[PDB]
Amino acid sequence: QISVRGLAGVENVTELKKNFNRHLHFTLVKDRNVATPRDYYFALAHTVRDHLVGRWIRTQQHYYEKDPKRIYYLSLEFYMGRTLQNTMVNLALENACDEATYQLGLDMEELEEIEEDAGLGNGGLGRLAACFLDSMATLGLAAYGYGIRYEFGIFNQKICGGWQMEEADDWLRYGNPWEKARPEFTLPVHFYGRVEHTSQGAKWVDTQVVLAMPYDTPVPGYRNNVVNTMRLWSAKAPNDGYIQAVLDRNLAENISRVLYPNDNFFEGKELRLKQEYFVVAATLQDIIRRFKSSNFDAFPDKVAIQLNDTHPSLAIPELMRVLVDLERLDWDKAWEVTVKTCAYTNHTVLPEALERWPVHLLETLLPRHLQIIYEINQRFLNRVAAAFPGDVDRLRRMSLVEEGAVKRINMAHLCIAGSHAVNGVARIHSEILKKTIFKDFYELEPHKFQNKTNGITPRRWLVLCNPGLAEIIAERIGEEYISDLDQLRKLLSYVDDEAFIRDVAKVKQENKLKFAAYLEREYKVHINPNSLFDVQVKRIHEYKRQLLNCLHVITLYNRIKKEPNKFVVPRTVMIGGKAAPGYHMAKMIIKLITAIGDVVNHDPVVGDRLRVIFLENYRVSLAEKVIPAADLSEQISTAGTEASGTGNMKFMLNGALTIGTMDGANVEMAEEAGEENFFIFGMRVEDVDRLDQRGYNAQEYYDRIPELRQIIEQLSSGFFSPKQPDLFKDIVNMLMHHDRFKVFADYEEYVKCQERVSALYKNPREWTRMVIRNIATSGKFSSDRTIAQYAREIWGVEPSRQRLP
Amino acid sequence: QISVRGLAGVENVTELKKNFNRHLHFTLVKDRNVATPRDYYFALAHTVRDHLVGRWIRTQQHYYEKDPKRIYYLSLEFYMGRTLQNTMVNLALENACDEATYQLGLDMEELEEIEEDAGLGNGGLGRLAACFLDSMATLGLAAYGYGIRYEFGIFNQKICGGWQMEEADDWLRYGNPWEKARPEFTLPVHFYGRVEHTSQGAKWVDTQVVLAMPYDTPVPGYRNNVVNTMRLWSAKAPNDGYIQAVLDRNLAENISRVLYPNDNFFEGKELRLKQEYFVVAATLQDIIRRFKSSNFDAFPDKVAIQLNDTHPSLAIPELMRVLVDLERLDWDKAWEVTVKTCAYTNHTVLPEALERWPVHLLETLLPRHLQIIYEINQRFLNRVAAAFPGDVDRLRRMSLVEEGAVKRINMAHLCIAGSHAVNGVARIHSEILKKTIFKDFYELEPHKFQNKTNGITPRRWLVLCNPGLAEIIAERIGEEYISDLDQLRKLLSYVDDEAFIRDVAKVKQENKLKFAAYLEREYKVHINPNSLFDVQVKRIHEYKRQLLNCLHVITLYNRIKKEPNKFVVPRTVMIGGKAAPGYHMAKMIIKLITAIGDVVNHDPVVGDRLRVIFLENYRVSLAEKVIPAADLSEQISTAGTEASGTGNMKFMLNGALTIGTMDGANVEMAEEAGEENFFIFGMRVEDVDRLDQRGYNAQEYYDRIPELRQIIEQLSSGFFSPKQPDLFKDIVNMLMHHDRFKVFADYEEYVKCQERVSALYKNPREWTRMVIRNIATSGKFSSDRTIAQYAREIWGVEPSRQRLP
Numbered sequence A, B: 001q002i003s004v005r006g007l008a009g010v011e012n013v014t015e016l017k018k019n020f021n022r023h024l025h026f027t028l029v030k031d032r033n034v035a036t037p038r039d040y041y042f043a044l045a046h047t048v049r050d051h052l053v054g055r056w057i058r059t060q061q062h063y064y065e066k067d068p069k070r071i072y073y074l075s076l077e078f079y080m081g082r083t084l085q086n087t088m089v090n091l092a093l094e095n096a097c098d099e100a101t102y103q104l105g106l107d108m109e110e111l112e113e114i115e116e117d118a119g120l121g122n123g124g125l126g127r128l129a130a131c132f133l134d135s136m137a138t139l140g141l142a143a144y145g146y147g148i149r150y151e152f153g154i155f156n157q158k159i160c161g162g163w164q165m166e167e168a169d170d171w172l173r174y175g176n177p178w179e180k181a182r183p184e185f186t187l188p189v190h191f192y193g194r195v196e197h198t199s200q201g202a203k204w205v206d207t208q209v210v211l212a213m214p215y216d217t218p219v220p221g222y223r224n225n226v227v228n229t230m231r232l233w234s235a236k237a238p239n240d241g242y243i244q245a246v247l248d249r250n251l252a253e254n255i256s257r258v259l260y261p262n263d264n265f266f267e268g269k270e271l272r273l274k275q276e277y278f279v280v281a282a283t284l285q286d287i288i289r290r291f292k293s294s295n296f297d298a299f300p301d302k303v304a305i306q307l308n309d310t311h312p313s314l315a316i317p318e319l320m321r322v323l324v325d326l327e328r329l330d331w332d333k334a335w336e337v338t339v340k341t342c343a344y345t346n347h348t349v350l351p352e353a354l355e356r357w358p359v360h361l362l363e364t365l366l367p368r369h370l371q372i373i374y375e376i377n378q379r380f381l382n383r384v385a386a387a388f389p390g391d392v393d394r395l396r397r398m399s400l401v402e403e404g405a406v407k408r409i410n411m412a413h414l415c416i417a418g419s420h421a422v423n424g425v426a427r428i429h430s431e432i433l434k435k436t437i438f439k440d441f442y443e444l445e446p447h448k449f450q451n452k453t454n455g456i457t458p459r460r461w462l463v464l465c466n467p468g469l470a471e472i473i474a475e476r477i478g479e480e481y482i483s484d485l486d487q488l489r490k491l492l493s494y495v496d497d498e499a500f501i502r503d504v505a506k507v508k509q510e511n512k513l514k515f516a517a518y519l520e521r522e523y524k525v526h527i528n529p530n531s532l533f534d535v536q537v538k539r540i541h542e543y544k545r546q547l548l549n550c551l552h553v554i555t556l557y558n559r560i561k562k563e564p565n566k567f568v569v570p571r572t573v574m575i576g577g578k579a580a581p582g583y584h585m586a587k588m589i590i591k592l593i594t595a596i597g598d599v600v601n602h603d604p605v606v607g608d609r610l611r612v613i614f615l616e617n618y619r620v621s622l623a624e625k626v627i628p629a630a631d632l633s634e635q636i637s638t639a640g641t642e643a644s645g646t647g648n649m650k651f652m653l654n655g656a657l658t659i660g661t662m663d664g665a666n667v668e669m670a671e672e673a674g675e676e677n678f679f680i681f682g683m684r685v686e687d688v689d690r691l692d693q694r695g696y697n698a699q700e701y702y703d704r705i706p707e708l709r710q711i712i713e714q715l716s717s718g719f720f721s722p723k724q725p726d727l728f729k730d731i732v733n734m735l736m737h738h739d740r741f742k743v744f745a746d747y748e749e750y751v752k753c754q755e756r757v758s759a760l761y762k763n764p765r766e767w768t769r770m771v772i773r774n775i776a777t778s779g780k781f782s783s784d785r786t787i788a789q790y791a792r793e794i795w796g797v798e799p800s801r802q803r804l805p
Ligand SMILES: CC1(C)c2ccc(C(=O)O)c3c(Nc4ccc(O)cc4)n(-c4ccc(O)cc4)c(c23)C[C@@H]1O
Pocket: A019, A022, A023, A026, A027, A028, A050, B022, B023, B026, B027, B050
């Protein structure tokens, strides 16, 4: 069909059909008479997976033979999405399978919709892990993703009566054709117990054992014949009245049962601590076994462990435990190895996200790790005291141990102390780390602190989800950009090219029709395809300020009612994302969005000039549908709160213009494109700080802005909940009296900036030319660039995009 | 190698090796460098399973096209054992795979030892189900086995300190290459709730739903191209704080977690009741769907439901529930259909085995079924009252409702009332049913009561486990006997044939060396291969009288110590079998066996003249090893207690002579061979009854038998437990004062009969000639004969051993 999707060679298609039919017969045990579309999806998935196997085996053999330094990306989350299209793209098989299935009478895109997302993450951090796996394989790194094979990923969200309802994400119900169970590589993980100090040294005894069974999933690089591994551990009860004892095996196996759905929030649940140690303990056993199959001097030359947030921070004391207690290294040598092995990525400054585990919980579950943590703290604070003699407050601030009613271990402090590199995920965030929350650590060890601005893979996030845009780009500049995204800057040459302008707008219109067709087919929801698609998709949080979007939406509605005869650019305002189950405010915000829609979408004076829709069950596969259809990308977090963002980058790559604050990677996106090509508004970090310094008074904004006052009175008086007039009193009260994110303070600039958005959209040519200037400068935000930096600046390995044989 | 194992055709071997290597590469994702023997086993298993798929699909299509009456064998247990060798035997692939794997450098028998038993049964009843599936496929019946896919089968038994320890039988740990999950055929099963009576009729509402997911396993007939299905249901939570709710999905899924390990004993556990309804409800939905894909007049013409014991007895009220409540048939028409559809097989007369569920438990879990059961009872008792006017005691005795402190439903009475056929499992047992425990039901409906003497499949139980014996037989009479076992009578012609006599003894000696090698390799246990192998393997129960064997073993030991210089036939006495976890006496009996061995096996005066060994973890695969090696088959249950037995038949088919009571199918085995060819001893049923009539006094036997008195004093005084002198006081006390199975009353005849056993074994030629007379007359005990009778006398279908194309 389109060239970026590869060749449908005659023999390749013939072989694909034969292997499809073989799987249908021998694997699905069906013939065409009874085969369901799901049977067809699985026959195709097995056929495509078969094309990975040779390279997968040879890649891993190649690493065994050449012994490169191995990169271990440890994460509690791998937000992978679906795998069938990604595999075909990266194997150059997409047109061939499309033709093969077409000749069999099947629509391959219909089959693709049958695959369950591997929804093993919450949001940005977990999706970063997924993009990173893709980029590390495309860059030829000997890299392994290590995580948990959750039986249930992030919950499936249903909207019922305008409210979020959570259902179990039973993604393995029909099996997983991608993974390969490796029950022969199963390893014991220990919990509880107690420490004996013998003549040999310390001994961790009387533990309860949980087995960790690895499942390996292939990670294909982009057309370089590299296939790396994602290894996900599954909890299994050890082999050794009767019925209840068998049933009680469920308790240990609950360790890998379900992903904790807290996006940016720490709740010290013991089961979550168990999950974190589970990944850490089994993974480090793997790492050490592989290292010995090559004395621990060389260990940091052969192993990098990257900690995705503090979630696997126990790797630092676990590595010490293994090196000291089992390998009998001296403490100082073991510590030198550990710090040189480990590096730590921080993802947020919000204090409620910081993992601060109660000491008594650690003492019970992991008694030897708490001892090692205390020893780490004593030695680290001795270094602090020697560098800053007499600075007692600095000692208290830097300690891994936090005092209080509940004594706790600060896992971020543990990570900094035990890592040779610490990085934030965007320039502004990494500077904030050095300036504020880790300033003490930066002053002790400035060399540790780095920036690694996040990115997204242009395979999943352009070639896969927006083949039309990838094609019109390739028609001009070739296909090299797909793994060399800075070549998109060549498109600045085409900013006055009438053909490209036409094609960019044509592609966007096709994507919008496709998304409108999706909403009609799957939900019987009708959206005006000739409206500006205004999209805010991301997890629901106060700091991301979906509520500020809500205020603007009601402003548009109230201005229409005030002057019904005045032309306004028609909009479909779309908001989607999941709220954590126990986050009352976030669930109220979802209900407000649907409640606004219930009024707006049924007002005959409004008609199709304005519609407000909550996109249900936002997840990786839905992001791939809606982001290519978006005109306006809402990135409106309070300045200083969004460490980087990555949804912002997806929209930029896919031809939406961005309205946003100078926050996270927005800053660098605007720098890359030129601020004249972004709708930047609102307080900067400095202005937020000035408000905090004098005290944020929302009443002052209410008193001075009639249009804002009108909206608050509508919320209070029940205008958006006539049957329950005080339904939204908590939102109103938070906004008026307890708003940590200063919604009102950006209201006026936001509404006026939104006016400028509409003004440009009335000029289709100039809208599209500004779009070109964004797409053309999105190259910096490829995760290949991010990974190349991690490789050279932290891991000490040189990337390579050369083909394996 | 040997002809009964088929042809190793040149192209077949070449194709097998290619498909082996394809599976190793694409399915196991290994190359030969790293492949474990388990990888090799799985590559072979997939290769062999691939050879079933075409016939499996075509068999089931054939049934769809020809619409024969379908047989549904409902059982809570399918004691299947391993599947790889059985599949190769029945597909005529065994020599070809043997040669193919040999050319790849692999020992196929080593690979076979890697397969986990599908241990989904307890003993005779569950193994009968497995043999029946094999025979119904070999006889061309459109037959389906329906059961539960237990995550954990019968526990793995370890002997530790001479005691049984139970471990979870994690048979699915490495997967199951045989089964095909059918998650698309998943069905809802309902529990709890309540009954509404509307205008339409009754309605079962407010239930909790458990999903039943079917897994299909192929059942190959013997070289007739028939492949039937065993469908096993797996419990799954329905699709619709948060974390605990996800974890609590385990509660519904516990329904299929583990097989209840009670052999012959009813404990009214609610979870077991749930399992029973689970199989019943999902299976009958399948049956009805398949029936509609062909008005319910014709339903009994198209459906037979065979109830394996009372365990799926809820099928009777469930079928009524569906026909009346959902299909809106009148009660009387629905009842006519039900009784003509259902038939019931009874497996034991022991009262403690009878399922008698508390009415309050049924009312809570299955409120509509209890209503239907009460209505069934009222109408049935009305028939009783009309046939036997004024016989009020008969009404009380026959009622489905049993009065008492806890009111209960007698599930056997439900089965008789709701079934057009009731059968026992051996002639003596089926007569006892008509004479005693079901005499009232027999007098009301004599036409209902049948016999179907049990049998065993000669595929698994001769060709598979004893290929040497199968070969020397085939060398004389051809291979037709393998599915026409009455042709073994041709071997009576060879009773004076020196070559056959030589070969029979040679085969037995090879099997004994092979089993001795097994015990050395797997347990470092040394047995004298030139000793008589005296084997009692079966579940441990008082009624099977392992204790009587114990008394004889100690007698042999005490006689040796009394006259050390006197020659005795050397024996290896082997006892194996599992005790139910909560059955104290059975566990004490295992400990006594090992305690006897601890004295006997270490007495230098005894040496290798006598050894006593407890065979650990007796299961189908171990039965296949030890039964072909046995010289003497211990079948010594108290007359009247063993309904049939089937282990007795396995030994007879495999060249052991039998010592036993006139009990169960022993009677018919002795009738078939001639009593002169069996070591029959002990009380007959009539003598047991005479003892009960006057009261069994064990003291009288103790007082009159010095050698018995000596053994009891050794047990009491601690001779077999010096470190815990009163370890066996409970056994002694039961024997002396509470022995329901009259161990002492058969002691003298047993010991003297055992003398006759030894006397014949001293004459190898006459021992072997008597063996020939047993093997030659074992043909009646083929489960093909049993199934042919079920087909013609209950199900109304005609068997056929003709090939499918
Ligand atoms: C070598 C090659 C071209 C091929 C040719 C022929 C057959 C066949 O059976 O006629 C093949 C199967 N069989 C086959 C296919 C599916 C199945 O379930 C069993 C066997 N598989 C194959 C593919 C995937 C596997 O996990 C295992 C083998 C492969 C086959 C792989 C390869 O494409």
